[PDB]
Antibody, heavy 217, light 207 residues
Framework: EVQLVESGGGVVQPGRSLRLSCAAS????????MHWVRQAPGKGLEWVAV????????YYADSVKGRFTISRDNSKNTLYLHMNSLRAEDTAVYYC?????????????????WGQGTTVTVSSAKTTAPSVYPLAPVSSVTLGCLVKGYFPEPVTLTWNSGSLSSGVHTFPAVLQSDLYTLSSSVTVTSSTWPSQSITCNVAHPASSTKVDKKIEP | YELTQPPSVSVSPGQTASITCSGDKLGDKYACWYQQKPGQSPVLVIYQHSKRPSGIPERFSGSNSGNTATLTISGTQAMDEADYYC?????????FGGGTKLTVLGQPKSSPSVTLFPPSSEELETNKATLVCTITDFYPGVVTVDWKVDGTPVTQGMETTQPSKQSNNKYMASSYLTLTARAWERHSSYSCQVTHEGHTVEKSLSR
């Protein structure tokens, strides 16, 4: 059966290069247009480039023009993406794909076979301790803890040294200004706080950080 | 041109799902559709508007009208819950739609609970200001978040998390608006608007 196997993904600095490979078997490789398509964390499919079956025509997304080049070695049944001048925003899973339509029909009939994906992660971030801020409002009450600007993973967050685990929501990290930001909320009865103490405890071992932040009105 | 599609479509098992793609010159092209499940490669389900490749279940079909193309799943199954992307091309590029998550309903719908927090005085000492909009207990698990400052839509400085599953099996997410301390002081009203199942839940702060 028809198959594409990718390799060459990695972790590099902005400004550097990578070569992705996509090794094809189970079809007449030189009879099909081939594409690269990428997918950033939680985002949609984003076309990158196409090379025609015979290698005569290459086209690129505006986002990569001048930086990435696509090629194929039909003698080795392999497709390449030469990624130069990498940027943080190039971070994504990269797929190769084969078109269903052979030869001149390749744009018309969809992409029928896809690689498994190879991950490219581009960052210049150094170890950075989080800043830990209180979240408080201007029957029940919702308080929280903002863990802003740490790198790398991991970080841990607990409430009252783990003693308070009910009514807690700890949200996924997101990348913001090339560092990670996380938050957690805790919902309690309004007669409990501020009469009783609520403290967020944040640990980030890379930066030797252990912070306790008491939530005040 | 850009291809757009609804971020979310939801149906109960057995119902027919309809997912529509639209774009300025889409009617001059053939549209195809991909199914993608989490951590998996896309799968071509429909091409040339209405044709199924071998192995794709008969319940997947497609149609087109005007500058739109529609994927239809007749008798939806729990296994069909996935992201669906349309794809065509324009004068110089291949174009993908932004994706629709099809949720096959396994529990009652639930609107989001929204909470908006101001920047802390501690953070403002650093010349920076972050507003935090937390969003919990929603199902299906797709929201769109829009921020306004003094009634004006914000386009910059925002990040929203991917939705994630809670212990009760509903979803949560959070959104952040980062401003300079000086921008924070210049404006009086701030709003986090969360759209879910065609209805918007708003929370605001005002000085």
């Amino acid at each position: 059966e028809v198959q594409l196997v990718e390799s060459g993904g990695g972790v590099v600095q902005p400004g550097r290069s990578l070569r992705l490979s996509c090794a094809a078997s189970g079809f007449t490789f030189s009879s099909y247009d081939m594409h690269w398509v990428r997918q950033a964390p939680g985002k949609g499919l984003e076309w990158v480039a196409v090379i025609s079956y015979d290698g005569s025509n290459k086209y690129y997304a505006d986002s990569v023009k001048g930086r990435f080049t696509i090629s194929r070695d039909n003698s080795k049944n392999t497709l390449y993406l030469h990624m130069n001048s990498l940027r943080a925003e190039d971070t994504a899973v990269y797929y190769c794909s084969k078109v269903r339509g052979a030869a001149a029909t390749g744009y018309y009939y969809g992409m029928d076979v896809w690689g498994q994906g190879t991950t490219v992660t581009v960052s210049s971030a150094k170890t950075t301790a989080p800043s830990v801020y209180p979240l408080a409002p201007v029957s029940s009450v919702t308080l929280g803890c903002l863990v802003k600007g740490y790198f790398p993973e991991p970080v841990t967050l607990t409430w009252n040294s783990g003693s308070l685990s009910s009514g807690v929501h700890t949200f996924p990290a997101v990348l913001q200004s090339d560092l990670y930001t996380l938050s957690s909320s805790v919902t309690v009865t309004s007669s409990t706080w501020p009469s009783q103490s609520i403290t967020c405890n944040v640990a980030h071992p890379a930066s030797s950080t252990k912070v306790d932040k008491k939530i005040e009105p | 041109y850009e291809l757009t599609q609804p971020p979310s479509v939801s149906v109960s098992p057995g119902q027919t799902a309809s997912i529509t793609c639209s774009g300025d010159k889409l009617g001059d092209k053939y549209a195809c559709w991909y199914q993608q499940k989490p951590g998996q490669s896309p799968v071509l389900v429909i091409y040339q508007h209405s044709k199924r490749p071998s192995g794709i279940p008969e319940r997947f079909s497609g149609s087109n009208s005007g500058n739109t193309a529609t994927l239809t799943i007749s008798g939806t199954q729990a296994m069909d819950e996935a992201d669906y992307y349309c794809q065509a091309w324009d004068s110089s590029t291949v174009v993908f739609g932004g994706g629709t998550k099809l949720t096959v309903l396994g529990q009652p719908k639930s609107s989001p609970s929204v909470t908006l927090f101001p920047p802390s005085s501690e953070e403002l000492e650093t010349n920076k200001a972050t507003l935090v909009c937390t969003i919990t207990d929603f199902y299906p698990g797709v929201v769109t978040v829009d921020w306004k400052v003094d009634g004006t839509p914000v386009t910059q400085g925002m990040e929203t998390t991917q939705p994630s599953k809670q212990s009760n099996n509903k979803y949560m997410a959070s959104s952040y608006l980062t401003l300079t301390a000086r921008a924070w002081e210049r404006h009086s009203s701030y709003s986090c608007q969360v759209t879910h199942e065609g209805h918007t839940v708003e929370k605001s702060l005002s000085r």
